[PDB]
Amino acid sequence: MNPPPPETSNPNKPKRQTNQLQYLLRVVLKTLWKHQFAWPFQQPVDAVKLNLPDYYKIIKTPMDMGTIKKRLENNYYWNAQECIQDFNTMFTNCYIYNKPGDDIVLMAEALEKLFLQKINELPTE
Numbered sequence: 001m002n003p004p005p006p007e008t009s010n011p012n013k014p015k016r017q018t019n020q021l022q023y024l025l026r027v028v029l030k031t032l033w034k035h036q037f038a039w040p041f042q043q044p045v046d047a048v049k050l051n052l053p054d055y056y057k058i059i060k061t062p063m064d065m066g067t068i069k070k071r072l073e074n075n076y077y078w079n080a081q082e083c084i085q086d087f088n089t090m091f092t093n094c095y096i097y098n099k100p101g102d103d104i105v106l107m108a109e110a111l112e113k114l115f116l117q118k119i120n121e122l123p124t125e
């Protein structure tokens with residue numbers, strides 16, 4: 001059974017657009033999305049479809065790139081650090097649910113390295 005997906009809008013949360021957040025969408029997220037290993041991360045984990053009934057028994061703060069992309073598109077975040085934390089949550093969830101050497105974990109490790117390379121330097125506000 002699947003929980004509701006994370007929110008992509010929140011009317012009482014203040015919005016912001018910064019050069020860093022624009023770069024996270026146009027360059028970082030959009031580049032990661034094209035990678036051959038990105039597909040497991042492009043939407044919320046479907047535990048009903050994937051026959052993973054214990055996924056949400058274990059992962060209590062779900063995150064995926066589809067949600068991040070919609071958040072960035074909505075100006076949901078106040079700053080880049082908030083968005084970067086949602087990427088880190090997404091990678092960490094994969095490491096928590098799975099074990100070292102698992103195919104899904106190799107995909108996450110490669111994306112995380114690419115992610116870090118791209119966020120090492122961000123634009124200046």
Ligand SMILES: O=C(N1CCc2sccc2C1)n1ccnc1
Binds near residue numbers: 040041094097098
């Ligand atoms: O175990 C899987 N997971 C497990 C954990 C995570 S975290 C982000 C995407 C996924 C997908 N599979 C297995 C087949 N496709 C995804």
